[PDB]
Amino acid sequence: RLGRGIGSGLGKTGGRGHKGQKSRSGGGVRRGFEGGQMPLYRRLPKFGFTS
Amino acid sequence: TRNGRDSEAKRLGVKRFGGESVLAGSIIVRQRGTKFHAGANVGCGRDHTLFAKADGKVKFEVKGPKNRKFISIEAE
Amino acid sequence: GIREKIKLVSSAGTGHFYTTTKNKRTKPEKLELKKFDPVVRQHVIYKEAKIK
Amino acid sequence: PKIKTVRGAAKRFKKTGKGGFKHKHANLRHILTKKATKRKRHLRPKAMVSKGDLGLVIACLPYA
RNA sequence: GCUUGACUGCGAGCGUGACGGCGCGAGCAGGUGCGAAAGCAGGUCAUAGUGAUCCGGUGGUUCUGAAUGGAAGGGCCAUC
RNA sequence: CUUUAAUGUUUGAUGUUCUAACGUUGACCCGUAAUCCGGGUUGCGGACAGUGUCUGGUGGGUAGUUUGACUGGGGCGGUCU
RNA sequence: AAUUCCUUGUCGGGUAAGUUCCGACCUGCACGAAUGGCGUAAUGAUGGCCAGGCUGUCUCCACCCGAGACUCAGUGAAAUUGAACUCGCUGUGAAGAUGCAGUGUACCCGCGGCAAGACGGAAAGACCCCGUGAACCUUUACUAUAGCUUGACACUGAACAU
RNA sequence: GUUUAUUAAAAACACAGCACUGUGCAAACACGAAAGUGGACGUAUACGGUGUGACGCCUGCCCGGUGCCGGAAGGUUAAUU
RNA sequence: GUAACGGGGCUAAACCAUGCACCGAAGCUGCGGCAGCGACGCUUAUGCGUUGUUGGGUAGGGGAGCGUUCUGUAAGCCUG
RNA sequence: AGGACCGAACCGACUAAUGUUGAAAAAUUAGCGGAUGACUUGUGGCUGGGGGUGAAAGGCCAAUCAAACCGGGAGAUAGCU
RNA sequence: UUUUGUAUAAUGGGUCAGCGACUUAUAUUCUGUAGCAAGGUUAACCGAAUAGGGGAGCCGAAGGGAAACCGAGUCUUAACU
RNA sequence: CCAUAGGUUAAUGAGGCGAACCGGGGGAACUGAAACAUCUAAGUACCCCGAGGAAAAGAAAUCAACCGAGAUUCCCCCAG
Ligand SMILES: [Mg+2]
Ligand SMILES: [Mg+2]
Ligand SMILES: [Mg+2]
Ligand SMILES: [Mg+2]
Ligand SMILES: [Mg+2]
Ligand SMILES: [Mg+2]
Ligand SMILES: [Mg+2]
Ligand SMILES: [Mg+2]
Ligand SMILES: [Mg+2]
Ligand SMILES: [Mg+2]
Ligand SMILES: [Mg+2]
Ligand SMILES: [Mg+2]
Ligand SMILES: [Mg+2]
Ligand SMILES: [Mg+2]
Ligand SMILES: [Mg+2]
Ligand SMILES: [Mg+2]
Ligand SMILES: [Mg+2]
Ligand SMILES: [Mg+2]
Ligand SMILES: [Mg+2]
Ligand SMILES: [Mg+2]
Ligand SMILES: [Mg+2]
Ligand SMILES: [Mg+2]
Ligand SMILES: [Mg+2]
Ligand SMILES: [Mg+2]
Ligand SMILES: [Mg+2]
Ligand SMILES: [Mg+2]
Ligand SMILES: [Mg+2]
Ligand SMILES: [Mg+2]
Ligand SMILES: [Mg+2]
Ligand SMILES: [Mg+2]
Ligand SMILES: [Mg+2]
Ligand SMILES: [Mg+2]
Ligand SMILES: [Mg+2]
Ligand SMILES: [Mg+2]
Ligand SMILES: [Mg+2]
Ligand SMILES: [Mg+2]
Numbered sequence: 001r002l003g004r005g006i007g008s009g010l011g012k013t014g015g016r017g018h019k020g021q022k023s024r025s026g027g028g029v030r031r032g033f034e035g036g037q038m039p040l041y042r043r044l045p046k047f048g049f050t051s
Numbered sequence: 052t053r054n055g056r057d058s059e060a061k062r063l064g065v066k067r068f069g070g071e072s073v074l075a076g077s078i079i080v081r082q083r084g085t086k087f088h089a090g091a092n093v094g095c096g097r098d099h100t101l102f103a104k105a106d107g108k109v110k111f112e113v114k115g116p117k118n119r120k121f122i123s124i125e126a127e
Numbered sequence: 128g129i130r131e132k133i134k135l136v137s138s139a140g141t142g143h144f145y146t147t148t149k150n151k152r153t154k155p156e157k158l159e160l161k162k163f164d165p166v167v168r169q170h171v172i173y174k175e176a177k178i179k
Numbered sequence: 180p181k182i183k184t185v186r187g188a189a190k191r192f193k194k195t196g197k198g199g200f201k202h203k204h205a206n207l208r209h210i211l212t213k214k215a216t217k218r219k220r221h222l223r224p225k226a227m228v229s230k231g232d233l234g235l236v237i238a239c240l241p242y243a
Numbered sequence: 244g245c246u247u248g249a250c251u252g253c254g255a256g257c258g259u260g261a262c263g264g265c266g267c268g269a270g271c272a273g274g275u276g277c278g279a280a281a282g283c284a285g286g287u288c289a290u291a292g293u294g295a296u297c298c299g300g301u302g303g304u305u306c307u308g309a310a311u312g313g314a315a316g317g318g319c320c321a322u323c
Numbered sequence: 324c325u326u327u328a329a330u331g332u333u334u335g336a337u338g339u340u341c342u343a344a345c346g347u348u349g350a351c352c353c354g355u356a357a358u359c360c361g362g363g364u365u366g367c368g369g370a371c372a373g374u375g376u377c378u379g380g381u382g383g384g385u386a387g388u389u390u391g392a393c394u395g396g397g398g399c400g401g402u403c404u
Numbered sequence: 405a406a407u408u409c410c411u412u413g414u415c416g417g418g419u420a421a422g423u424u425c426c427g428a429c430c431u432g433c434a435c436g437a438a439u440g441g442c443g444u445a446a447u448g449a450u451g452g453c454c455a456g457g458c459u460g461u462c463u464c465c466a467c468c469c470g471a472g473a474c475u476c477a478g479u480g481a482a483a484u485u486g487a488a489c490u491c492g493c494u495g496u497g498a499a500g501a502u503g504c505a506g507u508g509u510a511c512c513c514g515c516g517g518c519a520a521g522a523c524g525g526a527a528a529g530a531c532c533c534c535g536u537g538a539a540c541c542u543u544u545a546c547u548a549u550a551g552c553u554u555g556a557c558a559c560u561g562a563a564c565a566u
Numbered sequence: 567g568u569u570u571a572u573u574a575a576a577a578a579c580a581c582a583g584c585a586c587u588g589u590g591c592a593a594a595c596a597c598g599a600a601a602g603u604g605g606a607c608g609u610a611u612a613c614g615g616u617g618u619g620a621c622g623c624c625u626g627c628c629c630g631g632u633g634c635c636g637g638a639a640g641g642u643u644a645a646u647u
Numbered sequence: 648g649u650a651a652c653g654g655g656g657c658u659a660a661a662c663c664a665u666g667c668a669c670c671g672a673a674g675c676u677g678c679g680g681c682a683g684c685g686a687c688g689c690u691u692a693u694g695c696g697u698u699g700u701u702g703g704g705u706a707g708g709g710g711a712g713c714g715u716u717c718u719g720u721a722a723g724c725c726u727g
Numbered sequence: 728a729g730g731a732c733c734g735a736a737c738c739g740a741c742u743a744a745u746g747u748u749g750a751a752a753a754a755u756u757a758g759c760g761g762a763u764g765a766c767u768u769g770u771g772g773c774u775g776g777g778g779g780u781g782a783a784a785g786g787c788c789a790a791u792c793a794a795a796c797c798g799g800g801a802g803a804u805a806g807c808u
Numbered sequence: 809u810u811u812u813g814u815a816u817a818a819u820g821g822g823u824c825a826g827c828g829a830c831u832u833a834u835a836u837u838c839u840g841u842a843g844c845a846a847g848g849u850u851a852a853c854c855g856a857a858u859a860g861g862g863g864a865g866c867c868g869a870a871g872g873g874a875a876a877c878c879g880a881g882u883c884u885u886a887a888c889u
Numbered sequence: 890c891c892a893u894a895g896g897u898u899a900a901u902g903a904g905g906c907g908a909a910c911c912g913g914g915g916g917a918a919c920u921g922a923a924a925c926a927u928c929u930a931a932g933u934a935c936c937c938c939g940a941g942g943a944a945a946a947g948a949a950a951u952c953a954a955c956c957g958a959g960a961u962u963c964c965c966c967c968a969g
């Protein structure tokens with residue numbers, strides 16, 4: 001139970017650190033986000049087909 | 052200004068030193084020009100990269116009239 | 128870059144080809160070289176063609 | 180609701196026996212002629228996904 | 244002077260990168276060239292001369308072919 | 324085969340003349356106690372105009388947006404492999 | 405010059421002295437002919453400048469009459485406010501101290517006054533910057549689109565002539 | 567005369583006048599998916615738009631650029647066939 | 648506002664060179680107490696003269712708890 | 728005769744002082760401009776939000792206007808505090 | 809609270825009381841724990857019904873290859889020590 | 890000129906209201922894509938029309954694959 005006092009060890013930040021995306025309500029990047037670059041599953045080419 | 056340009060460092064130099072045990076094919080030193088020359092059981096790449104042609108200990112020695120520095124492998 | 132890429136097609140009819148470049152200002156004559164053909168597993172003469 | 184797989188990653192990675200993922204090498208589409216044959220030959224065989232990207236791949240592929 | 248090794252399939256073991264990747268490589272197989280041979284040749288003294296993926300184009304391929312036989316389309320190889 | 328002279332055919336290009344579609348914000352009659360509308364009569368126009376689909380051009384008239392970063396603040400200048 | 409950067413251009417007039425004004429000069433950085441040029445009586449809560457009259461505007465303020473301010477009785481707010489036992493100086497210090505160091509001074513507490521400080525009060529700074537924010541507006545930015553316009557086909561037919 | 571009701575009344579806007587241009591009346595234009603209405607129960611001595619802004623003396627040169635107007639032989643070119 | 652020994656004050660109460668003392672911290676050592684961890688002696692889910700050692704802490708990670716309301720326990724138990 | 732003159736009502740709002748938790752969320756006092764006209768005013772009516780209306784200031788459209796107010800999408804989104 | 813750094817003359821709070829912020833659903837992975845075990849387990853539904861039935865399915869015990877295919881091997885290649 | 894339009898009576902029926910659900914006619918944007926046009930949001934919000942206790946759909950010019958199944962609707966799988 002985060003954010004329930006000093007003694008709990010997870011107070012005043014809820015384990016989210018300081019003012020990042022993870023600290024915002026509903027914040028955080030989508031799956032595969034590489035900081036702005038096209039992710040590895042897009043740098044590499046498609047191959048094959050499903051039989 | 053019209054300056055402020057450079058290239059990424061290519062990480063040259065000696066990778067395995069004297070007396071180190073190496074496997075066949077391991078490159079000992081990467082260089083520009085023949086700072087070192089290939090000796091016994093040592094090959095020379097197309098970019099003058101010296102690689103081991105046999106397993107053994109790396110030994111540095113100086114021989115010849117030109118006072119050059121040679122790398123050889125003593126395969127026990 | 129003004130040198131243009133060309134393809135060398137094997138004469139054996141396998142359809143294998145190599146690709147390289149050639150200078151068009153000089154050396155108008157077609158390029159003929161003996162190169163290995165993987166389909167017939169032999170070194171045969173390759174003839175210049177057009178990349179398309 | 181059911182988790183949706185990232186379809187772009189599902190068309191490029193196949194799970195292996197020990198849980199790994201194999202992918203084809205890049206840099207072999209349309210500027211390959213100027214690349215040495217040895218370079219092209221090494222890119223032809225299939226490759227293993229690196230350890231750093233294992234977490235990202237598994238996240239994109241939860242059902243496989 | 245003679246030539247096309249600016250070879251095809253591979254590659255022990257290393258280097259350098261967070262990664263994508265880049266680089267070096269003896270040796271093996273098949274076919275070559277130059278040498279009488281030992282041998283050397285998987286481009287250029289080396290380090291710049293470059294652009295990922297998607298989409299589309301071209302050639303090859305008994306891989307696939309939505310009832311079946313084809314085909315379209317897709318895949319693979321070569322390549323723009 | 325060329326050169327093709329004529330021959331029918333099949334599509335078009337204009338021009339002229341019609342009326343019967345269509346137009347009439349011309350006249351008259353009726354619905355009708357009515358400057359609407361509809362119907363009738365007549366005149367004028369007429370295969371146009373006008374409208375639908377498709378299509379080329381034009382279109383800040385009206386929309387949705389874009390208009391980079393580094394930088395001894397920013398802009399300007401310079402730089403980006 | 406509602407236009408002149410250099411610039412208070414130069415000369416003349418007005419003043420004891422005029423970076424403004426007026427008249428000229430032309431060297432128009434960067435006036436100019438209906439995005440009008442030049443003049444123009446009259447008009448103007450129009451802009452600038454000068455003179456007479458006039459005056460506490462001023463030299464330089466004085467007095468007086470009223471309404472507040474002050475005292476008493478009654479009623480009785482407000483913005484603000486971490487807590488205060490709430491001094492000066494020099495130095496230090498999230499780099500301009502009532503609160504730290506050193507030192508000096510200061511009996512306890514009101515009332516009428518003045519505003520130097522409490523980086524005083526007011527309002528998540530309007531300037532500056534940032535966000536892959538917002539909105540309006542512009543155009544030979546991009547992509548569209550209403551509208552306008554072109555042709556084909558349909559509504560839409562006949563005859564004749566080339 | 568008008569204007570920023572609530573920091574700007576002005577040299578700004580309007581103004582009579584002037585010129586260009588569009589508009590033949592089912593007018594142009596505008597409001598309207600359309601019908602219709604305004605323009606106007608007016609008809610170029612009229613109406614709309616634009617710029618200038620009484621009056622006096624006057625309004626010079628450039629059509630290359632960008633628009634607009636006129637031309638239509640040729641080049642290019644959509645739907646369709 | 649002295650304001651360039653913190654101040655007083657100092658001709659050594661300054662500086663230089665030798666000493667021997669002492670003061671000086673939550674460091675160290677004593678005498679207790681708590682907790683984590685390591686290999687042992689017996690015994691070992693417990694625990695034992697254990698012993699050695701460790702125990703500043705934000706972001707953050709791990710572990711163990713307190714208390715609040717409600718359900719079962721509870722037609723029980725506490726209670727004019 | 729006059730968008731003529733001086734000047735009350737009426738209407739405007741140029742200057743200054745006060746007032747700035749006001750008597751007043753724009754006023755009062757002393758002056759000021761127009762005051763037969765493009766005047767002013769009463770009572771009704773019409774034009775509705777990318778729209779109106781505007782002698783044109785992005786002015787005004789219920790103390791709100793470079794796009795009114797109310798409800799809904801809606802717990803928009805907010806790499807910021 | 810935010811910071812390299814705040815007695816800071818940086819933000820927040822006049823005070824008290826009450827209220828006020830890591831939840832929920834589904835899916836997936838990992839750890840712990842319990843059960844069964846080369847097997848494990850049912851979903852909807854049936855059902856006097858938290859039982860039982862229902863193994864439809866799902867995961868695992870076999871992989872390699874783009875695929876056809878082959879299979880404790882398989883792919884690559886004409887072939888691989 | 891018959892007619893027709895039109896007109897006057899008489900019978901029936903309809904008008905409006907109401908929560909959600911249903912069918913149909915229209916139909917956004919914020920937002921996500923770390924911008925933004927295709928796309929997403931979403932045929933959602935909203936507006937309009939109509940009906941019922943349910944509505945809609947419905948008795949193969951359907952699927953299968955050389956074996957067969959046998960209208961529509963709903964649930965769990967198939968399957969992210
Ligand atoms: Mg912590
Ligand atoms: Mg914070
Ligand atoms: Mg963070
Ligand atoms: Mg088929
Ligand atoms: Mg725009
Ligand atoms: Mg948008
Ligand atoms: Mg910048
Ligand atoms: Mg000047
Ligand atoms: Mg002078
Ligand atoms: Mg002058
Ligand atoms: Mg001018
Ligand atoms: Mg002119
Ligand atoms: Mg002009
Ligand atoms: Mg006036
Ligand atoms: Mg004057
Ligand atoms: Mg005077
Ligand atoms: Mg004080
Ligand atoms: Mg002080
Ligand atoms: Mg100080
Ligand atoms: Mg006092
Ligand atoms: Mg005072
Ligand atoms: Mg004062
Ligand atoms: Mg930026
Ligand atoms: Mg005002
Ligand atoms: Mg007014
Ligand atoms: Mg005013
Ligand atoms: Mg004017
Ligand atoms: Mg011209
Ligand atoms: Mg011309
Ligand atoms: Mg200690
Ligand atoms: Mg209870
Ligand atoms: Mg008058
Ligand atoms: Mg008067
Ligand atoms: Mg004042
Ligand atoms: Mg007057
Ligand atoms: Mg208002």
Ligand SMILES: [Mg+2]
Pocket residue numbers: 794
């Ligand atoms: Mg808007």
Ligand SMILES: [Mg+2]
Pocket residue numbers: none
């Ligand atoms: Mg609202």
Ligand SMILES: [Mg+2]
Pocket residue numbers: 800
């Ligand atoms: Mg929404």
Ligand SMILES: [Mg+2]
Pocket residue numbers: none
């Ligand atoms: Mg919100």
Ligand SMILES: [Mg+2]
Pocket residue numbers: none
């Ligand atoms: Mg403070």
Ligand SMILES: [Mg+2]
Pocket residue numbers: none
């Ligand atoms: Mg405060």
Ligand SMILES: [Mg+2]
Pocket residue numbers: none
């Ligand atoms: Mg478990």
Ligand SMILES: [Mg+2]
Pocket residue numbers: none
């Ligand atoms: Mg059961």
Ligand SMILES: [Mg+2]
Pocket residue numbers: none
């Ligand atoms: Mg089964």
Ligand SMILES: [Mg+2]
Pocket residue numbers: none
């Ligand atoms: Mg193998």
Ligand SMILES: [Mg+2]
Pocket residue numbers: 922
């Ligand atoms: Mg977005």
Ligand SMILES: [Mg+2]
Pocket residue numbers: 942
């Ligand atoms: Mg009923």
